[PDB]
């Protein structure tokens, strides 16, 4: 399994604990982009996994230097690939405005 610290962060993200997540990432910034193949579970995956995305939580991850270049689910989809699969222009636009890469 992943570290207790990463599991603690991911739980706080899933639970919508904005202030706790902010504090964890202030104190332990290197957690922000840690992902676990083959599920690709990660702080970001906990946000993007949801049919209705919590953009406050996504903004918090962005403030703490989350990136959008690694896969975010067990399909090995990047954030942009997920947006494409879901035909979600809201997510597409957010990702583009945050320099997310687009695969070929």
């Amino acid at each position: 399994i992943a570290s207790a610290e990463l599991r603690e962060l991911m739980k706080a993200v899933s639970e919508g604990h904005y202030e706790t997540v902010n504090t964890i990432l202030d104190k332990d910034p290197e957690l922000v982009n840690q992902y676990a193949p083959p599920t690709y579970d990660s702080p970001l995956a906990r946000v993007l996994n949801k049919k209705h995305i919590d953009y406050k939580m996504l903004d918090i991850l962005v403030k703490h230097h989350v990136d959008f270049d690694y896969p975010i689910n067990y399909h090995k989809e990047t954030p942009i690939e997920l947006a494409c699969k879901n035909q979600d222009l809201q997510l597409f636009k957010y990702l583009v405005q945050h320099n997310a890469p687009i695969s070929e």
Binding site: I1, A2, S3, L6, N33, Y35, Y70
Partner: peptide, 5 residues
């Protein structure tokens, strides 16, 4: 990046 597991 890939987490230490």
């Amino acid at each position: 990046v890939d987490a230490v597991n």
